[PDB]
Symmetry: D2
Subunit: 196 residues, 4 copies
């Protein structure tokens, strides 16, 4: 039922910021596995739910969150990147950012600190808080998705699982984050922002 | 779809060990709420699953675990108690206990320590480990059910949420546990044991 | 080293909103135990730290958080209540509240929903976010303290562990929260607010 | 106060099972950082403890567990590996394994499944349960150390953080685990076993 989305660009389109090998493995191996495991899990769940098996439903939660979240997180991630990205955003998004973070650079600073501070595997996110009407930074462990676990609407996500950058930046997570700013697709972040 | 099971005895049948007021509130108020909230949650979940909404499925996990677990835990609990309970078990169960804990009294000791040691709300459990083929003691937080979260088959559960004993024993959890041994339905624990 | 603070009022001073029995048990039994267990734990920790025993330091974390948090949370709680409290706050605090929540009543609404929504044992909090410079509502499980786990400065806390209200309101948590508004010490919340 | 232990062998001594690049990065970069961050954290903690600052003590727990656990876990890991390892264990350890797992191969199977099943970052462990007197398999998230969080005495640990194997086995965690069996230092696991 769920499927692996095609990448809107070639695997080597983000060089030299993120090399082709990482993109190929990240998409065709990591994301593909999450989609496949998600469909298997949803199927078992449909089954447990049909016969009112509460125990089975609860036992399947970790697998559904990990794989379901994995699919959601990476799907957004691909659209957040672009060989034509980089620079700074414009319009209302830029204003919202100055408003809520003081300046674009302070925002970069914050999101970078949150991403680098993730203990173990996880994601750094720029999300929108519907209740307050402000932008908000949050970090999620493993594949826990932003909206499903915090209620925030995801605008921009940064994957900090080691498979995201190890082949190229090894243990230096800060180098990875410094480079990713050059390929952020602000046009996509902007429309996600305008949508909510 | 799920329903509140009738108690196999009168509300005051466990006096003076657990008074009638607690039993009445615990069953007709606490357990009833879990069953009702469970049906509402499973329904929303059926809905999220039908349209492949992964985000909604993940957001509903806490409510399904709390209410689904609440229903499962209390349902077992009622059958674990009896106005004719108390004393010690006999047969294979008693042997399994001596085998795995040394003696019946050391077992009581262990399970009591685990129950009293729960930080906040939770349950103390005597469960069966299918893999090892031995009895095992475990404690679960809030309403997290034994089997669904640990894989152990539940044999005997002791509810240590404060609503379990506060009206009668106030803050003295140890007095509550000392009294509950007088109403344990060993015949029920035995058949749960024989079943697995 | 740490000690049980005296209550700034008589045990029955909050009647009929919170009866004397609850206040007496809550202070002399529950809080006293947390203080005593905290001193024992800090002592063991001083010891583990002296000989560089990392394993022991990590094993003691749950007990230090539960008891240390228990002491911190209840200490603030006593000052948040007053036989002369109730009504609405005035000055800058009232403005900060209208600003961040729309109105005082919407604020009450929010904090009440957060408190009632705590699964199991926990606290509902009105805190101050130093980074953003705005008021913020948060809920913490068990005795996890607000500042130590979220960074927010605590202004007003509402204890929703069942021992907080069970003797008087039984399972009806909403009745408990409706009554507590009549004894909130706004003068204390205000000065905590002015301090940060 | 704490220090980076020297490796008991050359960085390329485990080839071709684990290449030299991984060993060099894993030891001189990853482990070194944990030791350095641990000393900084213990120092801040000594300070918080001296002035009875409970809030600061609690805020430092995540950093102490991650770095303290990181140091403990990797220190054991280095001794668990050897260019002269591989094969099967002998003596009492082998008997304990047959006893508790049926056979050596079923044990390998179990530990492999536990290691591969870790969601995100973590470790698979073969530990000793002092209470029961049996061997036990457990998995821990991130750098949470075995003994400090479960009470089990660590005998053999397998690091499944992606930095452990990504450069060489990429996303195929099962290939990594199949290869690591060839360098397990059973003589070290045996003496850890005899010690407890
Ligand atoms: Mn990824
Ligand atoms: Mn209950
Ligand atoms: Mn309390
Ligand atoms: Mn490692």
């Amino acid at each position: 039922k769920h499927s692996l989305p095609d990448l809107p660009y070639d695997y080597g389109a983000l060089e030299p910021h993120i090399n082709a090998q990482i993109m190929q493995l990240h998409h065709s191996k990591h994301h593909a596995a999450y989609v496949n495991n998600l469909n298997v899990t949803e199927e078992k769940y449909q089954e447990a739910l049909a016969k009112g098996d509460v125990t089975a439903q609860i036992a399947l939660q970790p697998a559904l969150k990990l794989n379901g979240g994995g699919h959601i997180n990476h799907s957004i991630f691909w659209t957040n990147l672009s060989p034509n990205g980089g620079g700074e955003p414009k319009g209302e998004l830029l204003e919202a950012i100055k408003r809520d973070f003081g300046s674009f650079d302070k925002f970069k600073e914050k999101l970078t600190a949150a991403s680098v501070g993730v203990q173990g595997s996880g994601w750094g996110w720029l999300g929108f808080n519907k209740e307050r009407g402000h932008l908000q930074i949050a970090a999620c462990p493993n594949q826990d998705p932003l909206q499903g676990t915090t209620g925030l609407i995801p605008l921009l996500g940064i994957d900090v699982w080691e498979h995201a950058y190890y082949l190229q930046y090894k243990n230096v997570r800060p180098d990875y984050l410094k480079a990713i700013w050059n390929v952020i697709n602000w046009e996509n972040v902007t429309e996600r922002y305008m949508a909510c």
